[PDB]
């Protein structure tokens, strides 16, 4: 089964969202500033490609409109999302849970039902004291299967 590298400097996959012109290599988590400096990365260090919900975080940087997840808001309901691993191209469609604040604006959409999903997180303003990206917006995509 698809495995995420132990070496944090090695690419684990590729994520693409055509409608938003996003094409990025995905690195192992957790998503710290160093990891996001490398590219978008898995949310948690213990993430698994066999999980029902796979989370990937990406930066928002206005100096570079098409950098990582800066242009993710351009991906509306129904937008195709491609997650490429070594042996498969997984396809997902953006749901109505998009561009929403992590808490109270939106929550568990399919984390338990309706199948496999990808949770894309735009991250900004990392707080070293708490280990949290204070500025976050989530986008949930469900597998086309």
């Amino acid at each position: 089964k698809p495995q995420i590298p132990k070496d944090k400097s090695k690419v684990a996959g590729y994520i693409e969202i055509p409608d938003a012109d996003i094409k990025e290599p995905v690195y192992p988590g957790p998503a710290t500033p160093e990891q996001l400096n490398r590219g978008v990365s898995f949310a948690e260090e213990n993430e698994s490609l066999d999980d029902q919900n796979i989370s990937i975080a990406g930066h928002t940087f206005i100096d570079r409109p098409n950098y990582q997840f800066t242009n993710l808001k351009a991906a509306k309901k129904g937008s195709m999302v491609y997650f490429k691993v070594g042996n498969e191209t997984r396809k997902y469609k953006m749901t109505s849970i998009r561009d929403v604040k992590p808490t109270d604006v939106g929550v568990l959409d399919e984390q338990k039902g309706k199948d496999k999903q990808l949770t894309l997180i735009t991250a900004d303003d990392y707080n070293e004291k708490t280990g949290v990206w204070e500025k976050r917006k989530i986008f949930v995509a469900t597998e086309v299967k």
Partner: peptide
């Protein structure tokens, strides 16, 4: 949880 980054 939804998650964080």
């Amino acid at each position: 949880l939804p998650e964080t980054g």
